[PDB]
Design an enzyme around this catalytic site. Structure first.
Site, PDB file in Angstrom:
ATOM      1  N   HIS A 123       1.349  -9.459   1.276  1.00  0.00           N
ATOM      2  CA  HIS A 123       1.123  -9.449  -0.169  1.00  0.00           C
ATOM      3  C   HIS A 123       2.282 -10.136  -0.914  1.00  0.00           C
ATOM      4  CE1 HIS A 123      -2.555  -7.223  -1.048  1.00  0.00           C
ATOM      5  NE2 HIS A 123      -2.222  -6.270  -0.193  1.00  0.00           N
ATOM      6  N   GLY A 156      -0.166   2.821   1.328  1.00  0.00           N
ATOM      7  CA  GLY A 156       0.937   1.955   0.959  1.00  0.00           C
ATOM      8  C   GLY A 156       0.591   1.103  -0.253  1.00  0.00           C
ATOM      9  N   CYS A 167      -7.981  -2.979   1.909  1.00  0.00           N
ATOM     10  CA  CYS A 167      -6.932  -3.343   0.973  1.00  0.00           C
ATOM     11  C   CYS A 167      -7.344  -2.849  -0.402  1.00  0.00           C
ATOM     12  CB  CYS A 167      -6.712  -4.865   0.974  1.00  0.00           C
ATOM     13  SG  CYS A 167      -5.455  -5.487  -0.194  1.00  0.00           S
ATOM     14  N   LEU A 168      -6.421  -2.179  -1.084  1.00  0.00           N
ATOM     15  CA  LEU A 168      -6.650  -1.672  -2.436  1.00  0.00           C
ATOM     16  C   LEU A 168      -7.041  -2.785  -3.409  1.00  0.00           C
ATOM     17  CD1 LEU A 168      -6.443   1.210  -2.247  1.00  0.00           C
ATOM     18  CD2 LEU A 168      -4.001   1.094  -2.822  1.00  0.00           C
ATOM     19  N   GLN A 178       0.489  -5.895  -6.385  1.00  0.00           N
ATOM     20  CA  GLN A 178      -0.742  -5.141  -6.612  1.00  0.00           C
ATOM     21  C   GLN A 178      -0.719  -4.266  -7.869  1.00  0.00           C
ATOM     22  OE1 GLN A 178      -0.774  -3.674  -2.443  1.00  0.00           O
ATOM     23  NE2 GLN A 178      -3.004  -3.962  -2.646  1.00  0.00           N
ATOM     24  N   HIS A 208       0.850  -5.806   6.638  1.00  0.00           N
ATOM     25  CA  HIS A 208      -0.183  -6.055   5.660  1.00  0.00           C
ATOM     26  C   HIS A 208       0.482  -6.179   4.294  1.00  0.00           C
ATOM     27  CE1 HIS A 208      -4.154  -5.267   3.569  1.00  0.00           C
ATOM     28  NE2 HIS A 208      -3.287  -4.904   2.644  1.00  0.00           N
ATOM     29  N   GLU A 209       1.340  -5.221   3.963  1.00  0.00           N
ATOM     30  CA  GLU A 209       2.038  -5.222   2.688  1.00  0.00           C
ATOM     31  C   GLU A 209       3.032  -6.359   2.526  1.00  0.00           C
ATOM     32  OE1 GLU A 209       2.845  -1.200   1.503  1.00  0.00           O
ATOM     33  OE2 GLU A 209       0.673  -1.166   1.847  1.00  0.00           O
TER      34      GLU A 209
HETATM   35  C1  BRR Z   1      -3.544  -1.853   6.335  1.00  0.00           C
HETATM   36  C2  BRR Z   1      -2.746  -1.515   5.075  1.00  0.00           C
HETATM   37  C3  BRR Z   1      -3.476  -0.508   4.184  1.00  0.00           C
HETATM   38  C4  BRR Z   1      -2.856  -0.498   2.779  1.00  0.00           C
HETATM   39  C5  BRR Z   1      -3.923  -0.334   1.688  1.00  0.00           C
HETATM   40  C6  BRR Z   1      -3.273  -0.525   0.311  1.00  0.00           C
HETATM   41  N1  BRR Z   1      -2.847  -1.909   0.211  1.00  0.00           N
HETATM   42  O1  BRR Z   1      -3.650  -2.996  -0.090  1.00  0.00           O
HETATM   43  C7  BRR Z   1      -1.596  -2.234   0.453  1.00  0.00           C
HETATM   44  O2  BRR Z   1      -1.236  -3.403   0.391  1.00  0.00           O
HETATM   45  C8  BRR Z   1      -4.476   1.068   1.752  1.00  0.00           C
HETATM   46  O3  BRR Z   1      -3.722   2.024   1.567  1.00  0.00           O
HETATM   47  O4  BRR Z   1      -5.665   1.250   1.992  1.00  0.00           O
HETATM   48 CO    CO Z   2      -3.271  -4.668   0.508  1.00  0.00          CO
END
Ligand code: BRR
Ligand code: CO
Ligand code: BL5
Length: 154
Positions: free
Chosen positions: A126, A42, A80-81, A47, A122-123
């Protein structure tokens, strides 16, 4: 490229989308492209350096809200990216009740569970300037602290 902590863009409150037009469509396609390239599950707009309330994943959620939740909560290890090399447990409701708008501006009401519920929360954070380390267990926070310091240092 995806923006990294501790960039301050990640700490802003992203702004509601008001124009559901061609720019939006381009932005959303860019988000997907970058997401596929980074092998992410995601992505949120902040981001990729766009302070707008847009989330995507592998559909599209614009101007989302989370408005209820199960009593049942659980901890899952998240990455998290925006935080390369960082993982830790985060406690969140198993199930959430949400609203959002699609690319055309129609409103949808949905209940999410399991993996979709987790990713969405999570998103969603952000978009509010909230990052998963803020909500991490005290124990995992400590484990990951040296690595956060290094991210801050570069
Ligand atoms: C727990 C959410 C994982 C999302 C993350 C990417 N990210 O930070 C999204 O906000 C991923 O793909 O590893
Ligand atoms: Co993230
Ligand atoms: C090392 C301790 C693991 C503790 C576990 C706690 N409860 N896990 C229940 C979840 C159920 C999914 C929730 C919706 C589970 O069974 N996770 C599996 C992976 C599921 C993959 C889905 N594509 C898991 O962690 N399995 C595992 C296998 C071997 C060793 C350790 C763990 C957990 O947090 N798992 C993590 C993955 C950990 C990655 C391994 N480095 C997890 O499922 N996180 C996560 C789930 C959904 C979205 C985002 C993140």
């Amino acid at each position: 490229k995806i923006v990294k902590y501790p960039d301050p863009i990640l700490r802003r409150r992203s702004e509601e989308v008001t124009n559901f037009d061609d720019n939006l469509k381009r932005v959303v396609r860019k988000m997907f492209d970058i997401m596929y390239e980074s092998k992410g599950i995601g992505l949120s707009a902040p981001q990729v350096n766009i302070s707008k309330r847009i989330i995507v994943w592998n559909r599209i959620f614009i101007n989302p809200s989370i408005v209820e939740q199960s009593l049942v909560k659980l901890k899952l290890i998240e990455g998290c990216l925006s935080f390369p090399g960082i993982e830790g447990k985060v406690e969140r409701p198993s199930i959430v009740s949400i609203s959002y708008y699609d690319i055309n501006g129609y409103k949808h009401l949905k209940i999410l569970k399991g993996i979709h519920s987790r990713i969405f929360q999570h998103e969603f954070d952000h978009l509010n300037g909230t990052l998963f380390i803020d909500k991490m267990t005290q124990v995992d926070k400590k484990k990951v602290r040296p690595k956060l310091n290094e991210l801050i240092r570069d």
